[PDB]
Design a protein around this ligand. Structure first.
Ligand SMILES: Cc1cc2nc3c(=O)[nH]c(=O)nc-3n(C[C@H](O)[C@H](O)[C@H](O)COP(=O)(O)OP(=O)(O)OC[C@H]3O[C@@H](n4cnc5c(N)ncnc54)[C@H](O)[C@@H]3O)c2cc1C
Length: 447
């Protein structure tokens, strides 16, 4: 219940109404700091807390793979909130109009939301802040250490963010107090899929390319995945994290992006488990440093998805190599269907198209080749963002924009050997990947 997790967006006349928690990023009932704070404020006001979720008009920019995963978890979430006598309301439309009307209609007393440094979340905040008079609060329920508390500026590298984050771990890494009780979605899903059906990803015979049996949605499935990762996969994480032929990753990203499981709950469970110190240190670096530095990248850089947020050395190196003749130039549709001359690159595209989750190691290869085979670094940014946000189940996430900015613009990275086209950006060759893992085995799986 650390008060540093709370931030004030707009002070106003405190109403004597039910506390409305605006759920956006953390779609879960257990281990939610935003949901717990709203219940704590509700009790002090002798008012009942409620949960609201907004189904926005931007869902048609993605695919059914993300829509179904999110809505199915919300169906489970509604039942869980009903266990604690917490009514959940789902609105369709723009949050600026829907949240303002719901607050006025329900005579809400306090408004609470979860933290998201993305631009579209900031867009909805400005509209809502201009249409309400009740107090507005936001809570970092996604990071172990609050985004504004870990660092007050943009961090240039991970070796400067790591000591800052670990110095606050004894304060913010704590257990979750219980959510004490308050003392149709199937129809929306049906019409949504009907609107997204014309743009469904299909192969030649019109069979759907997506396979939805790899990651089942819901808060329940995330816990079983977490338990299976610790017992079965945590020991070999340090030595097999970069081998895509083996499914040794944790597979928590689709659940983490939608907030179906708390990352802090993962850290708390991993810290107790007795495993290889090397593997535990490698996993904690990914879920604590790189995950939360990604939120830091989106929170302190308004242009996190543009060439303007690259480091100065990368901008100068890429600019000096703009006129360099590219070995090949593929358009967006050739990249979408895996029509390149690198069977390793396409093999990643098939895995992304069929499973919605490309391996972490091949994700770096995938994003850097788009830089090599595009007209400008800016057009590489657009294609990488477009492909990642359309087909990744964990897409439209600060991890994506920071991850893409890492591969193409060398954000949170250092300069390497000067090359053509790519300049000083870290290079990854087809020769180097064969020396690290069985490339042919990865290719044959995704053909
Ligand atoms: C170009 C590019 C784009 C990416 N786009 C996304 C994205 O849109 N959404 C997304 O969630 N991840 C993205 N990743 C980050 C990373 O690849 C994934 O988080 C990770 O692969 C997710 O699968 P996992 O949980 O089974 O891997 P694990 O090895 O099990 O990692 C566990 C968790 O640590 C975090 N993590 C791991 N690697 C990174 C990383 N490089 N940066 C930040 N956090 C990390 C993730 O939350 C991850 O769930 C991207 C990486 C790159 C290089």
């Amino acid at each position: 219940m650390n008060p540093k997790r709370i931030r004030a967006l707009k002070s106003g006349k405190q109403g004597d109404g039910p506390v409305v928690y605006w759920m956006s990023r953390d779609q879960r009932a257990e281990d939610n700091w935003a949901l717990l704070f709203s219940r704590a404020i509700a009790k002090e006001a002798n008012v009942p807390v409620v949960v609201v979720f907004c189904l926005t008009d931007e869902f048609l920019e993605a695919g059914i793979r993300q829509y179904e995963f999110m809505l199915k978890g919300l169906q489970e979430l509604e039942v869980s909130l009903s266990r604690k006598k917490i009514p959940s309301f789902f609105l369709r439309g723009d949050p600026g109009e829907k949240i303002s009307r719901f607050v006025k209609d329900y005579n809400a007393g306090t408004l609470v939301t979860d933290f998201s440094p993305l631009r579209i979340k900031n867009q909805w905040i400005e509209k809502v802040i201009s249409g309400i008079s009740i107090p507005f609060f936001e809570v970092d329920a996604h990071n172990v250490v609050p985004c504004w508390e870990a660092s007050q500026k943009h961090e240039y590298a991970a070796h400067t963010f790591r000591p800052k984050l670990y110095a606050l771990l004894p304060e913010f890494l704590e257990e979750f107090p219980e959510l004490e009780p308050n003392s149709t979605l199937s129809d929306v899903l049906e019409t949504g899929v009907k609107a997204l059906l014309p743009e469904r990803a299909l192969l030649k015979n019109k069979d759907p390319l997506f396979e939805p049996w790899h990651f089942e949605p819901g808060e329940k499935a995330a816990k079983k995945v977490m338990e299976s990762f610790i017992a079965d996969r945590l020991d070999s994480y340090g030595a097999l994290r970069n081998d895509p032929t083996k499914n040794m990753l944790s597979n928590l990203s689709p659940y983490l992006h939608f907030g179906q499981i708390s990352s802090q709950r993962v850290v708390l469970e991993v810290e107790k488990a007795e495993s290889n110190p090397g593997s535990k240190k490698a996993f904690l670096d990914e879920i604590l440093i790189w995950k939360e530095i990604s939120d830091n990248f989106c929170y302190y850089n308004p242009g996190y998805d543009g060439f303007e947020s690259f480091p100065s050395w990368a901008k100068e190196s890429l600019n000096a190599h703009r006129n360099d003749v590219r070995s090949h130039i593929y358009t967006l549709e050739e990249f979408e269907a895996g029509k390149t001359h690198d069977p390793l690159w396409n093999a990643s595209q098939m895995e992304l198209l069929s499973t919605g989750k490309m391996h972490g190691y091949t994700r770096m290869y995938w994003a850097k080749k788009i830089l090599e085979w595009s007209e400008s670094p800016e057009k590489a940014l657009e294609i990488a963002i477009c492909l990642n946000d359309r087909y990744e189940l964990d897409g439209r996430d600060p991890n994506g924009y920071a991850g893409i900015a890492w591969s193409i613009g060398g954000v949170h990275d250092r300069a390497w050997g000067e090359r053509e086209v790519t300049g000083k950006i870290r290079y990854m060759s087809y020769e180097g990947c064969k020396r690290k893992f069985d490339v042919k085995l990865y290719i044959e799986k995704y053909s």
